[PDB]
Amino acid sequence: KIPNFVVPGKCASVDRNKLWAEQTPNRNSYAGVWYQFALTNNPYQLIEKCVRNEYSFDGKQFVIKSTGIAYDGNLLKRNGKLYPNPFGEPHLSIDYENSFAAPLVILETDYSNYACLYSCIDYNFGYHSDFSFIFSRSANLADQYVKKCEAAFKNINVDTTRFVKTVQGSSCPYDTQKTV
């Protein structure tokens, strides 16, 4: 029963305070739709391809609507919320229904091109587990940005080889998802 993602090691020291201060003032510049460019293995992503994450800010926290096709083959719509941590930590917590929240640091983002997401937890006895992501603003991401992220994760020692381009494209029923 111990999950496969619960592994030996510590989370990395990211400077969350700095990020949090650069980031809090421009939280509306984050709403919008973000396509998932690639993510390190993550059992909580029940959407395999065409991952279109649409964030809607309301002043305090965002309300997510996520769409694409399941692993099963079907069209899937998943609801979530990304609000600021509630124990006052400098990062927000992401929380999709039919799930317990997780922390989620926006490692680097330019609000209109890519956003690198990192989310890690330390446990006792030396274990931990991290989940990373890359968000693009447009289905296909300019491999000039994919390199600014890869550069960022290499600073907090995430094995880049771990990501896996999800599949975004012409194929994708975006137009269908936009209706749910």
């Binding site: 029963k1 229904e97 039919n98 799930s99 317990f100 929240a101 006792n124």
Partner: protein, 174 residues
């Protein structure tokens, strides 16, 4: 959604594990007489159980039973076993719905009381549960005395615990 409600501040305590843990001597019926209220446990009174020792498995096939806080009689059926990574007194709980969780035997005399700690640290908060198991269904017996000591000396305030009621109503079938 949210953070489970039982998470609290602070990391898990770093308690000691019983020195030479003998699964085989630990088998049998054990009654829960004081517990830190634990959400994954439906039964709340007359809590009693049987730890059946297997030896090709080198683990226990535990069955627990008792009453609801409402009044049905429930019966849970999990597995609990030592593991490759740590000394046998630090076992793992493999019950159906519940998270794999640890079962640390802080101290036991096998014949009388067993003090079990179980807590997963999360970052700087914890989800901490503990037990005071006795071989007698006496809630004021020698177990509590003994075990509340152990827990305090290990960092788990005994005040955190509540007593499991064992009265006239009890039916120990497990």
């Amino acid at each position: 959604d949210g953070i489970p409600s039982f998470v609290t501040a602070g990391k898990c305590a770093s308690v000691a594990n019983q020195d030479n843990f003998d699964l085989r001597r630990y088998a049998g019926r054990w009654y829960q007489t004081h517990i830190i209220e634990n959400a994954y446990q439906p039964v709340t009174r007359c809590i009693h159980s049987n730890y059946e020792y297997s030896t090709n498995d080198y683990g226990f096939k535990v069955t627990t039973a008792g009453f609801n806080p409402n009044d049905e009689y429930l019966k849970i059926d999990f597995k609990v076993y030592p593991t490759k990574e740590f000394p046998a007194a630090h076992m793992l709980i493999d019950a159906p719905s519940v998270f794999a969780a640890p079962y640390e035997v802080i101290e036991t005399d096998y014949e009388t009381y067993s003090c079990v700690y179980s807590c997963i640290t999360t970052d700087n908060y914890k989800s901490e549960f503990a037990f005071v198991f006795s071989r007698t269904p006496q809630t004021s017996g020698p177990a509590v005395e003994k075990t509340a000591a152990v827990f305090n000396k290990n960092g788990v305030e005994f005040s955190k615990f509540v007593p499991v009621s064992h009265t006239a109503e009890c039916v120990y079938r497990a």
